[PDB]
From Swiss-Prot, chain B:
Signal peptide location: none
Superkingdom as given in the UniProt entry: Viruses
UniProt name for this protein: Inner capsid protein VP1
Native species: Bombyx mori cytoplasmic polyhedrosis virus (BmCPV)
Family membership noted in the UniProt record: Belongs to the turreted BTV-fold inner capsid family.
Disulfide bridge map: none
The protein's role, per its UniProt record: Inner capsid protein that self-assembles to form an icosahedral capsid with a T=2 symmetry, which consists of 120 copies of VP2, with channels at each of its five-fold vertices. This capsid constitutes the innermost concentric layer of the viral mature particle.
Localization (cell): Virion
Amino acid sequence: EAFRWSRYFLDELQLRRLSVGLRLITNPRIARRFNGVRIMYLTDDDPDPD
Amino acid sequence: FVPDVPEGYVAVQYAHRLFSSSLANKRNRVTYTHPPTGMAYPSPTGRPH
């Protein structure tokens, strides 16, 4: 029965942990590489990052 | 060559009463007020012709 699937050749615990890690990776707060910029000629009155 | 003043422009005699200090976005900007409307324009950008 052990040969029916390789289970990517990992320990069962590495799978169970891998799950929660996939939950970390797709947390919005981590996703901090930003894509694309808008060039525009404007005054910086009252700057806010957002 | 003397360029023509375009169509939308409003003549304004310069006077000291026009330019003044004013608070504007946490700065003491040299505001200009436009006599046709009386509106204040702290930034040189965005002022009426």
